[PDB]
Design a protein around this ligand. Structure first.
Ligand SMILES: [Zn+2]
Length: 616
């Protein structure tokens, strides 16, 4: 219960600081060709030719049967593809006409806007079952807001703001209806329906709030600031978006780690950031959380968790492969004064020139215009300290000069997208996974539910973890690490994973400890059991070529890297091959991967193992 935003202002404060009549819009006016030329630089011709290809574009009708197919077969794409084509056409024409200024694209902007007003709804087939009727087809009697409608509303606000004049010159009723549609589909429902899930009014501890709150709220807020010229209404609206987002900010951990991972960062942290930027601009700088430490951490997560050459930390049901918008990262980095994020944005560019964001997000498209020339000058670099410690999420990133990166975690087995992975580590060598976390497959008939933990990628059996008395971890809030510490100077991460195992495992403490020195990684296991029932087993997931030159030695050759894993001779090593039938896994790792299995005869109520990994 930080309630940051509410502390920064109440409703009456807010009435003073708001900027009315859209004097806050940072783009030059439409008819100011000189200012736009400057801002566009070299995007100008690129943007015009993109818009030239759309001079003859047929705006697409979305048939009732496309929406109805969601009920019939779960096919969302049949509705989503033409919708998205229409939005992107609309966004592209906007940029192209801001680029040229001659009115060559006004007809198609008008055509797009008028067709959009004629649609019953901007909500997606998939999200429409939240209406009273629960159906996948729009009910002209009701409007809700999802991710689609929000963005569709903000794109339309922006079209309306920018081309109100040439549109009224042609016919004043287009802009009139645009104001009607945005009022009816965004503004009126936003103020009148307390019960949309993503708003998190009538959230209770334990319910989830996720990226929808900052995403939806950011487009709502755009819509108010562009379209609502009554100051008392705007004040009440913005204060409502503040109370809403405050629930997202309170839900998130203060250390800034995204427990979902980097793939959702763009639209989580990144939408939170967008919201705050929009809020700031709209209050002439007066309600700005952009210098909040937590927000900055949330932005540098993306830097810290990006290992290299496409590989990312992938705790839980996330992909080992990952990316990022350089332009969003740059912009975010500027706003919270992270020289780190700014250099990292340049790094992701990887020698390519930054150009305008296209796609279907007006705010991101327009903003990317302003940051574009600075980013082309920034020096490409991925500097970050040797240790990153997220103490609430319980993630530790440690890296040495010789190209090893370890990600270890504590945590609990009820994380979002949870894997039973408490205490697990992943080792990258020069960015290449060597001891890996398999990650996400395509969502079968069990993914969500019990029977989730009968799938192998979700079991502790298939993470870099011991099986205690031959027993794996269990799922649930109760099943977690204790006394997780991180010594930032000695590069030592250490945690008791005992409570992450069920009663049968019969363990008091099991302390799993990671030490990174400059040359090598020492893994220790230190355990005291309530009864020695079965032998412990230890596992490591890997790929490439694996060999066993001698007892207590394994060698892994993967993607140019080559490593030695030294293991107690008390164990007998075997390799298991894991055919990858699921394309969502074989996309990443290829055809198969491997689990190294360490098994023993020894059974002791107390013991320790020392494992050592280095290059050769
Ligand atoms: Zn995993």
């Amino acid at each position: 219960e930080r309630d940051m935003l509410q502390k920064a202002a109440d409703e009456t404060t807010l009435k003073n600081v708001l900027v009315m009549k859209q004097a806050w819009v940072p783009y030059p006016a439409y008819t100011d060709r000189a200012a736009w030329d400057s801002l566009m630089g070299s995007n100008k011709q690129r943007l015009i030719a993109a818009g030239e290809k759309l001079l003859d574009y047929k705006w697409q009708l979305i048939p009732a049967t496309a929406y109805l197919e969601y009920e019939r077969t779960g096919n969302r794409k049949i509705m989503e593809v033409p919708y998205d084509a229409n939005r992107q056409a609309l966004n592209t024409l906007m940029l192209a006409e801001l680029a040229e200024g001659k009115g060559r694209f006004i007809d198609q902007l008008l055509n797009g806007a008028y067709m959009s007003c004629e649609m019953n709804s901007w909500v997606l087939s998939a999200h429409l079952p939240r209406q009273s009727s629960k159906r996948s087809l729009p009910d002209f009697r009701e409007q809700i807001i999802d991710l689609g409608s929000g963005g569709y509303g903000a794109l339309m606000a922006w079209v309306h703001y920018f081309f109100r004049k040439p549109f009224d010159k042609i016919n004043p009723v287009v802009s009139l209806q645009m104001r009607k549609a945005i009022k009816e589909r965004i503004l009126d429902p936003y103020m009148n329906d307390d019960d949309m899930w993503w708003m998190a009014f009538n959230w209770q501890p334990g319910e989830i709030i996720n990226n929808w709150n900052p995403w939806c709220n950011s487009n709502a807020l755009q819509c108010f600031l562009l379209m609502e010229n009554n100051k008392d209404r705007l004040a009440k609206a913005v204060y409502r978006s503040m109370k809403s987002v405050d629930k997202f900010i309170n839900f998130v951990k203060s250390d800034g780690a995204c427990e979902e991972g980097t793939s959702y960062w763009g639209h989580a942290a990144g939408k939170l950031y967008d919201y705050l930027q929009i809020l700031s601009d709209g209050t002439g700088g007066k309600i700005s959380l952009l210098n909040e430490p937590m927000i900055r951490r949330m932005g540098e997560y993306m830097s810290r968790s990006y290992v290299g050459n496409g590989w990312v930390v992938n705790f839980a049901d996330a992909s080992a492969q990952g990316g990022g918008d350089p332009l969003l990262i740059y912009r975010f980095g500027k706003a919270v004064n992270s020289n780190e994020m700014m250099h990292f944005a340049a790094y992701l560019l990887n020698g390519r020139k930054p150009y305008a964001t296209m796609g279907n997000d007006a705010f991101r498209s327009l903003q990317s215009l302003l940051c574009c020339n600075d980013l082309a000058k920034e020096t490409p670099k991925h500097d970050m300290p040797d240790v990153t410690w997220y103490p609430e999420t319980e993630f530790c990133y440690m890296k040495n000069k010789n190209g090893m990166f370890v990600a270890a975690k504590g945590g609990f087995n009820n994380e979002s997208h949870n894997h039973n992975d408490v205490g697990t580590f992943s080792l990258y060598v020069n960015t290449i996974p060597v001891i890996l976390d398999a990650g996400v497959g395509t969502y079968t008939k069990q993914t969500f539910g019990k029977d989730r933990y009968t799938i192998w990628t979700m079991q502790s059996n298939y993470h870099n973890l011991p099986m205690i008395n031959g027993i794996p971890q269990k799922y649930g809030q109760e099943y977690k690490a204790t006394n997780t510490t991180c010594n930032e100077k000695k590069r030592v991460f250490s945690t008791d994973i005992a409570a992450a195992y069920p009663s049968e495992a019969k363990v008091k403490n099991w302390i799993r400890s990671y030490t990174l020195d400059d040359r090598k990684l020492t893994i220790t296991d230190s355990y005291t059991l309530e009864e020695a029932v079965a032998p412990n087993q230890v596992n490591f997931m890997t790929w490439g070529n694996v060999t066993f030159p001698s007892q207590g030695k394994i060698q892994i050759e993967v993607k140019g890297q080559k490593v030695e894993l030294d293991y107690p001779t008390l164990f007998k090593a075997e390799l298991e091959t894991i055919q990858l039938d699921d394309p969502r896994l074989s996309n990443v790792w290829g055809k198969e991967i491997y689990r190294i299995t360490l098994k023993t005869n020894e059974k002791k109520e107390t013991g320790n193992y020392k494992f050592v990994i280095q290059q050769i």
